[PDB]
């Protein structure tokens, strides 16, 4: 019988229109002393909106059935009259965004590591019928060792929203596929575009299609006129060209091979997928050692 009173609030990890994420300590039971992350959703707001309700149930179901080392673990879920609670593993490594902002640009073997781990998470979600959509660096966390964790499966985390039918334009749209922005229907190919955009950001310091305003940023994304940096290896350039294509069906990973098709690319040739999945490959950055 898990109740709100079983946890002590330590601090706020995030705050949005739909609720808050806390670092908490369990103070009862066999996990006494153990640290978790706790998402607390405001029920009253969600219940009114039918698609907000659906999407909230969806996140629960998703994390309940997913189990993979590169995806965040859900431990408990419970409810009161006013609140919905998700108890997830606490990830002390911070957002991948922080590493990139620290470093400016990643070396290629640094990028390769993260992108490889992410590709295995995506392959797992794709086998389960799940589409991540947005691989902006703030949507990816690191655990205590420095390994990747995908975390963004729930409601829009933003404090103000764009429109009142979708939550597509509320955050940055710089890592999203053209077909998502056009709302013309899409599938898992959307994730491989986004991996390409993340990769481009890692290796050049900014996402591939940016404008001074949103309307121009959107136009740039739909146009999809890619600028490949000359200083990147031929392997990195070949992979970026195959991910960032306007024709979704023709992206690497779009076909039946999915992740295995991307994982076979020469850019990832030094990866042992057995060791990586087992988390035996040393990460490029150790959050524990970070001053
Ligand atoms: C929950 C997994 C996690 C594990 N360990 C440490 N940090 C974590 N999170 C990862 C997610 N992150 C971004 C974030 N998501 C949010 C969702 C909401 C919502 F309530 F949905 F409105 C509000 C603020 C939010 N901020 C905060 C820290
Ligand atoms: Zn929103």
PDB file of N, CA, C and O in Angstrom, residues 18-21 37-42 46 51-66 71-77 84-88 125 130 132-133 150-157:
ATOM      1  N   UNK A  18       1.193  21.202 -16.012  1.00  0.00           N
ATOM      2  CA  UNK A  18       0.395  20.053 -15.579  1.00  0.00           C
ATOM      3  C   UNK A  18       0.831  19.463 -14.241  1.00  0.00           C
ATOM      4  O   UNK A  18       0.189  18.548 -13.721  1.00  0.00           O
ATOM      5  N   UNK A  19       1.921  19.971 -13.682  1.00  0.00           N
ATOM      6  CA  UNK A  19       2.414  19.433 -12.427  1.00  0.00           C
ATOM      7  C   UNK A  19       3.883  19.683 -12.178  1.00  0.00           C
ATOM      8  O   UNK A  19       4.453  20.636 -12.716  1.00  0.00           O
ATOM      9  N   UNK A  20       4.486  18.818 -11.355  1.00  0.00           N
ATOM     10  CA  UNK A  20       5.848  18.990 -10.872  1.00  0.00           C
ATOM     11  C   UNK A  20       6.578  17.659 -10.766  1.00  0.00           C
ATOM     12  O   UNK A  20       5.965  16.610 -10.574  1.00  0.00           O
ATOM     13  N   UNK A  21       7.895  17.706 -10.880  1.00  0.00           N
ATOM     14  CA  UNK A  21       8.705  16.520 -10.615  1.00  0.00           C
ATOM     15  C   UNK A  21       9.580  16.826  -9.411  1.00  0.00           C
ATOM     16  O   UNK A  21      10.194  17.895  -9.356  1.00  0.00           O
ATOM     17  N   UNK A  37      12.558   9.713  -8.140  1.00  0.00           N
ATOM     18  CA  UNK A  37      11.968  10.904  -8.730  1.00  0.00           C
ATOM     19  C   UNK A  37      10.466  10.710  -8.687  1.00  0.00           C
ATOM     20  O   UNK A  37       9.968   9.611  -8.927  1.00  0.00           O
ATOM     21  N   UNK A  38       9.738  11.764  -8.345  1.00  0.00           N
ATOM     22  CA  UNK A  38       8.296  11.625  -8.230  1.00  0.00           C
ATOM     23  C   UNK A  38       7.595  12.655  -9.095  1.00  0.00           C
ATOM     24  O   UNK A  38       7.763  13.856  -8.900  1.00  0.00           O
ATOM     25  N   UNK A  39       6.827  12.181 -10.067  1.00  0.00           N
ATOM     26  CA  UNK A  39       6.029  13.092 -10.880  1.00  0.00           C
ATOM     27  C   UNK A  39       4.632  13.230 -10.290  1.00  0.00           C
ATOM     28  O   UNK A  39       3.948  12.235 -10.070  1.00  0.00           O
ATOM     29  N   UNK A  40       4.232  14.465  -9.993  1.00  0.00           N
ATOM     30  CA  UNK A  40       2.910  14.724  -9.431  1.00  0.00           C
ATOM     31  C   UNK A  40       2.092  15.546 -10.421  1.00  0.00           C
ATOM     32  O   UNK A  40       2.407  16.709 -10.669  1.00  0.00           O
ATOM     33  N   UNK A  41       1.049  14.932 -10.980  1.00  0.00           N
ATOM     34  CA  UNK A  41       0.163  15.583 -11.950  1.00  0.00           C
ATOM     35  C   UNK A  41      -1.113  16.130 -11.320  1.00  0.00           C
ATOM     36  O   UNK A  41      -1.716  15.501 -10.441  1.00  0.00           O
ATOM     37  N   UNK A  42      -1.523  17.303 -11.794  1.00  0.00           N
ATOM     38  CA  UNK A  42      -2.743  17.948 -11.331  1.00  0.00           C
ATOM     39  C   UNK A  42      -3.966  17.323 -12.012  1.00  0.00           C
ATOM     40  O   UNK A  42      -4.229  17.560 -13.182  1.00  0.00           O
ATOM     41  N   UNK A  46      -6.238  17.837 -16.016  1.00  0.00           N
ATOM     42  CA  UNK A  46      -6.152  16.730 -16.959  1.00  0.00           C
ATOM     43  C   UNK A  46      -7.512  16.102 -17.286  1.00  0.00           C
ATOM     44  O   UNK A  46      -7.834  15.899 -18.456  1.00  0.00           O
ATOM     45  N   UNK A  51      -8.111  14.359 -24.453  1.00  0.00           N
ATOM     46  CA  UNK A  51      -6.841  13.894 -24.997  1.00  0.00           C
ATOM     47  C   UNK A  51      -5.707  13.998 -23.973  1.00  0.00           C
ATOM     48  O   UNK A  51      -4.748  13.222 -24.021  1.00  0.00           O
ATOM     49  N   UNK A  52      -5.816  14.940 -23.039  1.00  0.00           N
ATOM     50  CA  UNK A  52      -4.855  14.995 -21.934  1.00  0.00           C
ATOM     51  C   UNK A  52      -5.007  13.743 -21.053  1.00  0.00           C
ATOM     52  O   UNK A  52      -4.016  13.180 -20.566  1.00  0.00           O
ATOM     53  N   UNK A  53      -6.251  13.316 -20.849  1.00  0.00           N
ATOM     54  CA  UNK A  53      -6.520  12.100 -20.086  1.00  0.00           C
ATOM     55  C   UNK A  53      -5.925  10.878 -20.787  1.00  0.00           C
ATOM     56  O   UNK A  53      -5.157  10.130 -20.186  1.00  0.00           O
ATOM     57  N   UNK A  54      -6.276  10.692 -22.058  1.00  0.00           N
ATOM     58  CA  UNK A  54      -5.727   9.605 -22.871  1.00  0.00           C
ATOM     59  C   UNK A  54      -4.204   9.553 -22.812  1.00  0.00           C
ATOM     60  O   UNK A  54      -3.622   8.500 -22.540  1.00  0.00           O
ATOM     61  N   UNK A  55      -3.565  10.698 -23.053  1.00  0.00           N
ATOM     62  CA  UNK A  55      -2.106  10.771 -23.065  1.00  0.00           C
ATOM     63  C   UNK A  55      -1.491  10.444 -21.703  1.00  0.00           C
ATOM     64  O   UNK A  55      -0.372   9.935 -21.638  1.00  0.00           O
ATOM     65  N   UNK A  56      -2.217  10.735 -20.622  1.00  0.00           N
ATOM     66  CA  UNK A  56      -1.730  10.428 -19.274  1.00  0.00           C
ATOM     67  C   UNK A  56      -1.775   8.915 -19.007  1.00  0.00           C
ATOM     68  O   UNK A  56      -0.825   8.338 -18.463  1.00  0.00           O
ATOM     69  N   UNK A  57      -2.880   8.278 -19.389  1.00  0.00           N
ATOM     70  CA  UNK A  57      -2.975   6.823 -19.318  1.00  0.00           C
ATOM     71  C   UNK A  57      -1.893   6.173 -20.194  1.00  0.00           C
ATOM     72  O   UNK A  57      -1.280   5.183 -19.800  1.00  0.00           O
ATOM     73  N   UNK A  58      -1.644   6.763 -21.359  1.00  0.00           N
ATOM     74  CA  UNK A  58      -0.652   6.250 -22.302  1.00  0.00           C
ATOM     75  C   UNK A  58       0.757   6.168 -21.705  1.00  0.00           C
ATOM     76  O   UNK A  58       1.460   5.181 -21.904  1.00  0.00           O
ATOM     77  N   UNK A  59       1.166   7.201 -20.974  1.00  0.00           N
ATOM     78  CA  UNK A  59       2.493   7.232 -20.357  1.00  0.00           C
ATOM     79  C   UNK A  59       2.631   6.144 -19.293  1.00  0.00           C
ATOM     80  O   UNK A  59       3.656   5.469 -19.194  1.00  0.00           O
ATOM     81  N   UNK A  60       1.596   6.005 -18.477  1.00  0.00           N
ATOM     82  CA  UNK A  60       1.515   4.925 -17.501  1.00  0.00           C
ATOM     83  C   UNK A  60       1.711   3.557 -18.156  1.00  0.00           C
ATOM     84  O   UNK A  60       2.587   2.791 -17.760  1.00  0.00           O
ATOM     85  N   UNK A  61       0.888   3.267 -19.157  1.00  0.00           N
ATOM     86  CA  UNK A  61       0.949   1.995 -19.871  1.00  0.00           C
ATOM     87  C   UNK A  61       2.305   1.755 -20.522  1.00  0.00           C
ATOM     88  O   UNK A  61       2.852   0.651 -20.446  1.00  0.00           O
ATOM     89  N   UNK A  62       2.832   2.794 -21.165  1.00  0.00           N
ATOM     90  CA  UNK A  62       4.147   2.729 -21.792  1.00  0.00           C
ATOM     91  C   UNK A  62       5.226   2.289 -20.814  1.00  0.00           C
ATOM     92  O   UNK A  62       5.915   1.304 -21.049  1.00  0.00           O
ATOM     93  N   UNK A  63       5.365   3.010 -19.708  1.00  0.00           N
ATOM     94  CA  UNK A  63       6.478   2.759 -18.805  1.00  0.00           C
ATOM     95  C   UNK A  63       6.286   1.475 -18.006  1.00  0.00           C
ATOM     96  O   UNK A  63       7.245   0.889 -17.516  1.00  0.00           O
ATOM     97  N   UNK A  64       5.037   1.045 -17.894  1.00  0.00           N
ATOM     98  CA  UNK A  64       4.721  -0.208 -17.237  1.00  0.00           C
ATOM     99  C   UNK A  64       5.221  -1.402 -18.048  1.00  0.00           C
ATOM    100  O   UNK A  64       5.700  -2.383 -17.481  1.00  0.00           O
ATOM    101  N   UNK A  65       5.108  -1.322 -19.372  1.00  0.00           N
ATOM    102  CA  UNK A  65       5.457  -2.459 -20.223  1.00  0.00           C
ATOM    103  C   UNK A  65       6.864  -2.386 -20.821  1.00  0.00           C
ATOM    104  O   UNK A  65       7.408  -3.392 -21.273  1.00  0.00           O
ATOM    105  N   UNK A  66       7.452  -1.198 -20.830  1.00  0.00           N
ATOM    106  CA  UNK A  66       8.833  -1.060 -21.265  1.00  0.00           C
ATOM    107  C   UNK A  66       9.796  -1.437 -20.142  1.00  0.00           C
ATOM    108  O   UNK A  66       9.604  -1.047 -18.991  1.00  0.00           O
ATOM    109  N   UNK A  71      16.096   3.215 -20.951  1.00  0.00           N
ATOM    110  CA  UNK A  71      14.804   3.859 -20.757  1.00  0.00           C
ATOM    111  C   UNK A  71      14.465   3.919 -19.259  1.00  0.00           C
ATOM    112  O   UNK A  71      14.702   2.952 -18.530  1.00  0.00           O
ATOM    113  N   UNK A  72      13.928   5.057 -18.804  1.00  0.00           N
ATOM    114  CA  UNK A  72      13.658   5.275 -17.376  1.00  0.00           C
ATOM    115  C   UNK A  72      12.672   4.249 -16.812  1.00  0.00           C
ATOM    116  O   UNK A  72      11.674   3.911 -17.452  1.00  0.00           O
ATOM    117  N   UNK A  73      12.968   3.745 -15.616  1.00  0.00           N
ATOM    118  CA  UNK A  73      12.129   2.751 -14.956  1.00  0.00           C
ATOM    119  C   UNK A  73      11.040   3.363 -14.067  1.00  0.00           C
ATOM    120  O   UNK A  73      11.310   4.253 -13.262  1.00  0.00           O
ATOM    121  N   UNK A  74       9.811   2.877 -14.217  1.00  0.00           N
ATOM    122  CA  UNK A  74       8.724   3.278 -13.337  1.00  0.00           C
ATOM    123  C   UNK A  74       8.644   2.284 -12.182  1.00  0.00           C
ATOM    124  O   UNK A  74       8.591   1.078 -12.408  1.00  0.00           O
ATOM    125  N   UNK A  75       8.630   2.789 -10.950  1.00  0.00           N
ATOM    126  CA  UNK A  75       8.624   1.926  -9.769  1.00  0.00           C
ATOM    127  C   UNK A  75       7.228   1.754  -9.174  1.00  0.00           C
ATOM    128  O   UNK A  75       6.768   0.634  -8.982  1.00  0.00           O
ATOM    129  N   UNK A  76       6.563   2.867  -8.870  1.00  0.00           N
ATOM    130  CA  UNK A  76       5.201   2.814  -8.357  1.00  0.00           C
ATOM    131  C   UNK A  76       4.313   3.804  -9.090  1.00  0.00           C
ATOM    132  O   UNK A  76       4.794   4.773  -9.683  1.00  0.00           O
ATOM    133  N   UNK A  77       3.007   3.582  -9.009  1.00  0.00           N
ATOM    134  CA  UNK A  77       2.041   4.559  -9.479  1.00  0.00           C
ATOM    135  C   UNK A  77       0.850   4.501  -8.555  1.00  0.00           C
ATOM    136  O   UNK A  77       0.407   3.416  -8.187  1.00  0.00           O
ATOM    137  N   UNK A  84      -2.156  12.699  -9.380  1.00  0.00           N
ATOM    138  CA  UNK A  84      -1.649  11.437  -9.929  1.00  0.00           C
ATOM    139  C   UNK A  84      -0.150  11.381  -9.655  1.00  0.00           C
ATOM    140  O   UNK A  84       0.566  12.361  -9.918  1.00  0.00           O
ATOM    141  N   UNK A  85       0.331  10.250  -9.139  1.00  0.00           N
ATOM    142  CA  UNK A  85       1.736  10.124  -8.736  1.00  0.00           C
ATOM    143  C   UNK A  85       2.432   9.019  -9.504  1.00  0.00           C
ATOM    144  O   UNK A  85       1.937   7.907  -9.550  1.00  0.00           O
ATOM    145  N   UNK A  86       3.590   9.325 -10.076  1.00  0.00           N
ATOM    146  CA  UNK A  86       4.449   8.318 -10.684  1.00  0.00           C
ATOM    147  C   UNK A  86       5.783   8.353  -9.956  1.00  0.00           C
ATOM    148  O   UNK A  86       6.406   9.401  -9.870  1.00  0.00           O
ATOM    149  N   UNK A  87       6.198   7.216  -9.412  1.00  0.00           N
ATOM    150  CA  UNK A  87       7.498   7.103  -8.761  1.00  0.00           C
ATOM    151  C   UNK A  87       8.442   6.414  -9.723  1.00  0.00           C
ATOM    152  O   UNK A  87       8.262   5.239 -10.041  1.00  0.00           O
ATOM    153  N   UNK A  88       9.431   7.160 -10.202  1.00  0.00           N
ATOM    154  CA  UNK A  88      10.396   6.659 -11.172  1.00  0.00           C
ATOM    155  C   UNK A  88      11.769   6.589 -10.530  1.00  0.00           C
ATOM    156  O   UNK A  88      12.012   7.226  -9.503  1.00  0.00           O
ATOM    157  N   UNK A 125      11.605   0.612 -28.234  1.00  0.00           N
ATOM    158  CA  UNK A 125      10.290   1.262 -28.287  1.00  0.00           C
ATOM    159  C   UNK A 125       9.556   0.918 -29.586  1.00  0.00           C
ATOM    160  O   UNK A 125       8.341   0.692 -29.596  1.00  0.00           O
ATOM    161  N   UNK A 130       5.868   1.978 -30.070  1.00  0.00           N
ATOM    162  CA  UNK A 130       5.987   3.314 -29.476  1.00  0.00           C
ATOM    163  C   UNK A 130       6.913   4.243 -30.278  1.00  0.00           C
ATOM    164  O   UNK A 130       7.985   3.837 -30.725  1.00  0.00           O
ATOM    165  N   UNK A 132       9.020   7.798 -30.048  1.00  0.00           N
ATOM    166  CA  UNK A 132       9.495   8.858 -29.158  1.00  0.00           C
ATOM    167  C   UNK A 132       9.283  10.309 -29.595  1.00  0.00           C
ATOM    168  O   UNK A 132       9.092  11.195 -28.754  1.00  0.00           O
ATOM    169  N   UNK A 133       9.543  10.470 -30.961  1.00  0.00           N
ATOM    170  CA  UNK A 133       9.242  11.768 -31.595  1.00  0.00           C
ATOM    171  C   UNK A 133      10.296  12.867 -31.475  1.00  0.00           C
ATOM    172  O   UNK A 133      10.602  13.530 -32.464  1.00  0.00           O
ATOM    173  N   UNK A 150      16.143   7.510 -21.840  1.00  0.00           N
ATOM    174  CA  UNK A 150      15.028   8.257 -22.427  1.00  0.00           C
ATOM    175  C   UNK A 150      13.949   8.410 -21.358  1.00  0.00           C
ATOM    176  O   UNK A 150      13.652   7.460 -20.649  1.00  0.00           O
ATOM    177  N   UNK A 151      13.344   9.589 -21.252  1.00  0.00           N
ATOM    178  CA  UNK A 151      12.440   9.867 -20.129  1.00  0.00           C
ATOM    179  C   UNK A 151      11.124  10.521 -20.541  1.00  0.00           C
ATOM    180  O   UNK A 151      10.178  10.557 -19.758  1.00  0.00           O
ATOM    181  N   UNK A 152      11.051  11.046 -21.758  1.00  0.00           N
ATOM    182  CA  UNK A 152       9.918  11.909 -22.098  1.00  0.00           C
ATOM    183  C   UNK A 152       8.723  11.187 -22.732  1.00  0.00           C
ATOM    184  O   UNK A 152       8.551  11.210 -23.948  1.00  0.00           O
ATOM    185  N   UNK A 153       7.871  10.583 -21.913  1.00  0.00           N
ATOM    186  CA  UNK A 153       6.742   9.838 -22.459  1.00  0.00           C
ATOM    187  C   UNK A 153       5.386  10.440 -22.133  1.00  0.00           C
ATOM    188  O   UNK A 153       4.369   9.957 -22.610  1.00  0.00           O
ATOM    189  N   UNK A 154       5.371  11.500 -21.330  1.00  0.00           N
ATOM    190  CA  UNK A 154       4.123  11.992 -20.774  1.00  0.00           C
ATOM    191  C   UNK A 154       3.604  13.295 -21.337  1.00  0.00           C
ATOM    192  O   UNK A 154       3.853  13.633 -22.491  1.00  0.00           O
ATOM    193  N   UNK A 155       2.865  14.023 -20.508  1.00  0.00           N
ATOM    194  CA  UNK A 155       2.254  15.270 -20.937  1.00  0.00           C
ATOM    195  C   UNK A 155       3.305  16.318 -21.222  1.00  0.00           C
ATOM    196  O   UNK A 155       4.432  16.240 -20.729  1.00  0.00           O
ATOM    197  N   UNK A 156       2.916  17.305 -22.010  1.00  0.00           N
ATOM    198  CA  UNK A 156       3.765  18.441 -22.274  1.00  0.00           C
ATOM    199  C   UNK A 156       4.254  19.104 -20.984  1.00  0.00           C
ATOM    200  O   UNK A 156       3.462  19.469 -20.112  1.00  0.00           O
ATOM    201  N   UNK A 157       5.565  19.262 -20.875  1.00  0.00           N
ATOM    202  CA  UNK A 157       6.167  19.764 -19.651  1.00  0.00           C
ATOM    203  C   UNK A 157       6.195  21.291 -19.604  1.00  0.00           C
ATOM    204  O   UNK A 157       6.599  21.877 -18.602  1.00  0.00           O
TER     205      UNK A 157
END
